[PDB]
Design a protein around this ligand. Sequence first.
Ligand SMILES: *C/C=C1/C(=C/c2[nH]c(/C=C3[NH+]=C(/C=C4\NC(=O)C(C=C)=C4C)C(C)=C\3CCC(=O)O)c(CCC(=O)O)c2C)NC(=O)[C@H]1C
Ligand SMILES: *C/C=C1/C(=C/c2[nH]c(/C=C3[NH+]=C(/C=C4\NC(=O)C(C=C)=C4C)C(C)=C\3CCC(=O)O)c(CCC(=O)O)c2C)NC(=O)[C@H]1C
Lengths: 313, 315
Amino acid sequence: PFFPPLYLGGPEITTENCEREPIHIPGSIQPHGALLTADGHSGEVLQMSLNAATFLGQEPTVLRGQTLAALLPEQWPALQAALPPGCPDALQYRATLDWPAAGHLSLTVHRVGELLILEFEPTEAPHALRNAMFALESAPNLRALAEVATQTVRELTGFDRVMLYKFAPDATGEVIAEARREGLHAFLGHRFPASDIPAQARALYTRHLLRLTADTRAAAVPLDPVLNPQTNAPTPLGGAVLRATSPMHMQYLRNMGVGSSLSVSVVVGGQLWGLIACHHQTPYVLPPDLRTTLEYLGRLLSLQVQVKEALEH
Amino acid sequence: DPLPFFPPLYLGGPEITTENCEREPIHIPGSIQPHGALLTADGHSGEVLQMSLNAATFLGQEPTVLRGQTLAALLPEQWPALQAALPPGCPDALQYRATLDWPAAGHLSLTVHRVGELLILEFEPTEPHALRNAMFALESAPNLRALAEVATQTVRELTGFDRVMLYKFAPDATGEVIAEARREGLHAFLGHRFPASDIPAQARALYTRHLLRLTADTRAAAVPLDPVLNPQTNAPTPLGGAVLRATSPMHMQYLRNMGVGSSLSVSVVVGGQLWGLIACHHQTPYVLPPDLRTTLEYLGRLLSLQVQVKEALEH
Ligand SMILES: *C/C=C1/C(=C/c2[nH]c(/C=C3[NH+]=C(/C=C4\NC(=O)C(C=C)=C4C)C(C)=C\3CCC(=O)O)c(CCC(=O)O)c2C)NC(=O)[C@H]1C
Ligand SMILES: *C/C=C1/C(=C/c2[nH]c(/C=C3[NH+]=C(/C=C4\NC(=O)C(C=C)=C4C)C(C)=C\3CCC(=O)O)c(CCC(=O)O)c2C)NC(=O)[C@H]1C
């Protein structure tokens, strides 16, 4: 099972008890965006991120009483239809708000039980994803596929290091491809132990396919209240992208000199086959539309990985 | 019985009947549909070899001035990118896409692929989160039928076609409409099954490699290539990879009896085999711009993944 979260008085994590930290309920978000939680029937704002006022331009109390109906007039019916009660929590709906305070905000929503979870991020507004698509499909073999993948992500994103990391039967990992800026250590062809990705994370990532950490020195921003009023229990945030990262992982990233990280699941036959992993040496907020392209590449790559191992076995 | 291709009409081959369908060489019609323009050019030197007769009106240049320059002089910014994305020896399914600003014709969608030592270049006029939301809605479908229904309804909402079907093949190559989303007043095709000779066996081999094709006007005349034969070889030009390829006149007649003016279709390919077809009908002529087609090409890949995922939850 899991320990209780810190903010509920559970034990601090060490390298003895990695497999039991409760990552999906850290009660906080990364600061490049804002998070609200709302009631699925009334649309009543229940929890908000302490930085909401920044992105939404709203007096702190005004929000925690208001309703999505009133708060997002055009979006609120779309949310009802898009996310019916009973739908999986992996289902996301996104729209773009041309919001008064901040030019354009990206809105992504999904439902956990009776709770909707809204995330707000700055956004903006050609053929590389189509070109990348055919380039993945014309690769002769798994090795060539892997090199095209990492190189494509690197040209689309500018990350300093993009690796394709591949799982072995006993959760042992290996870097089979890597595109990187000049002058970095090379992680190509290395293997790492199975505890580097603990079992409770491996389950979450077969379900939700993208996660990121935009700044490894930034402090988390708490939800308020931290417990869901509906349940007086921790809000599950496993599916939110703004979800705050475990401090045990952020400490490992600083020991490496990494300012920003992103990763994408490659799920083959209902099992996590590997990851597209991105390093950057400095902080880096990847804009939602660009992330969506990596989301597409994850499904493309997942399909082609199966095609290409089939022509070996 | 499977039989090898007739020579094309313009090399003295016979005309086609219900008796010799599987023998029409559909990959070398020697012509394009008129809503765009097609050039061919030597893979290495860049010399322009063939062009469709209509290429003057889409590119605003005399045919002889166009043929007298190399791609390095006609598309200076694109030629080096053309060389890097389509190296010699690469498969003919590998495509490269770029948008152009052309003086006379506005914004131009350039799609390139290579066949042998020949670069084929197609030019078409080109013009929020629907795809992303569509992607998530496809993956949360409980089951195959739900998935079929979401897919055909998404595709209609994105294109507006009168009738969008998901057509699934059986082991003996018969087919059955397993889902459709159609316009009020149209008669359903849901549940009908059709014989194996409705898609002949030379077309099934073509449709596993190239994944999307379309007829924009069932009543337009084809636009010839000029010259019709490749000066490289004095053999016909492989146009099998070209979305601008003109359609067999046999199939264009079947559609006019149906009252159909426009046709599009996307292959769903599973385990290296053609699992089925996303098929779209329209009663009037109808041209879908290339960036919109790209969204359909993405969905055809996503659906192929999702179908496997759904079938494996089924034993
Ligand atoms: C006592 C627990 C430890 C631990 C926990 C932990 N690790 C993750 C996530 C990841 N760890 C990864 C391992 C690597 N990243 C690299 O860059 C390299 C080498 C180049 C390795 C071997 C990876 C790829 C992830 C994925 C997450 C991501 O995208 O960054 C978590 C999950 C945190 C969360 O879900 O919020 C946790 C709890 N890691 C250890 O090394 C031990 C000390
Ligand atoms: C003697 C040859 C005949 C023939 C030729 C032919 N047919 C195709 C391609 C297709 N035929 C299809 C059949 C149907 N279309 C429909 O709308 C329905 C029912 C709703 C059916 C049963 C389909 C789906 C295709 C694929 C292409 C498309 O969807 O438009 C070809 C290939 C054309 C080419 O690649 O250039 C050919 C040569 N059809 C016959 O029925 C016989 C008489």
